[PDB]
Amino acid sequence: LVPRGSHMVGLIWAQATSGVIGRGGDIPWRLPEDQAHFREITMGHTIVMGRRTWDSLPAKVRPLPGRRNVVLSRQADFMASGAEVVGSLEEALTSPETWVIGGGQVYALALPYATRCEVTEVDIGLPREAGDALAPVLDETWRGETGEWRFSRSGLRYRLYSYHRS
Numbered sequence: 805l806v807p808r809g810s811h812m813v814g815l816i817w818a819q820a821t822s823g824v825i826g827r828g829g830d831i832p833w834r835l836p837e838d839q840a841h842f843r844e845i846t847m848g849h850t851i852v853m854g855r856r857t858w859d860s861l862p863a864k865v866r867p868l869p870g871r872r873n874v875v876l877s878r879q880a881d882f883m884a885s886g887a888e889v890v891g892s893l894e895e896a897l898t899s900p901e902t903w904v905i906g907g908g909q910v911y912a913l914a915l916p917y918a919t920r921c922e923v924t925e926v927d928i929g930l931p932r933e934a935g936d937a938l939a940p941v942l943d944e945t946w947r948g949e950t951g952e953w954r955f956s957r958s959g960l961r962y963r964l965y966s967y968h969r970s
């Protein structure tokens with residue numbers, strides 16, 4: 805689908821219905837089904853994340869295996885074992901296929917160049933709070949399909965959105 809000479813940038817995130825994606829340096833829910841979905845989409849590709857999202861990774865999956873981990877930071881001395889640290893978006897988006905995996909700052913940074921968004925919506929009524937990380941706002945040029953609601957093992961329900969644009 806992707807010509808190897810092109811640079812497909814995709815965004816992937818899970819959000820509460822309110823748009824909350826992050827809180828207190830963590831994701832305020834657990835959804836193994838979403839983790840699986842995220843793994844399915846990003847596997848074998850370059851992934852790009854903000855430094856704070858690197859900090860948020862569970863140790864057992866830091867770095868995320870099977871993927872080239874790229875971390876954006878302005879700290880030249882930042883230690884990110886198993887990952888590479890770059891100081892600019894330009895040097896982070898050199899692969900034919902890149903998935904930007906968070907957080908709020910880097911979604912907003914990469915969004916203008918993105919042509920794919922893979923969104924998990926979790927039906928949890930977490931209101932937006934001060935200091936929360938929020939999902940980026942998509943313009944009208946995006947289009948795609950909304951999947952049906954599904955119960956997770958835990959009884960938490962979620963659904964998948966696949967957006968794209970030219």
Ligand SMILES: NC(=O)c1ccc[n+]([C@@H]2O[C@H](COP(=O)([O-])OP(=O)(O)OC[C@H]3O[C@@H](n4cnc5c(N)ncnc54)[C@H](OP(=O)(O)O)[C@@H]3O)[C@@H](O)[C@H]2O)c1
Binds near residue numbers: 818854909
């Ligand atoms: N629900 C989800 O799908 C999901 C996914 C990922 C993350 N999250 C959540 O999102 C939250 C973190 O998001 P966030 O917005 O606070 O932080 P973030 O986007 O993960 O990281 C921001 C950091 O990235 C670096 N950075 C940002 N813009 C840059 C630029 N233009 N050039 C170079 N470096 C740059 C800076 O690092 P330095 O400060 O080191 O310079 C900055 O502090 C956490 O709560 C996390 O759990 C949620």
Ligand SMILES: Cc1nc(N)nc(N)c1OCCCOc1cc(Cl)c(Cl)cc1Cl
Binds near residue numbers: 818831834862
């Ligand atoms: C979890 C997730 N889900 C989706 N659909 N997209 C993401 N970017 C995403 O975040 C990837 C970076 C954070 O990765 C994790 C964070 C936590 Cl708190 C846990 Cl328990 C697991 C993972 Cl992989």
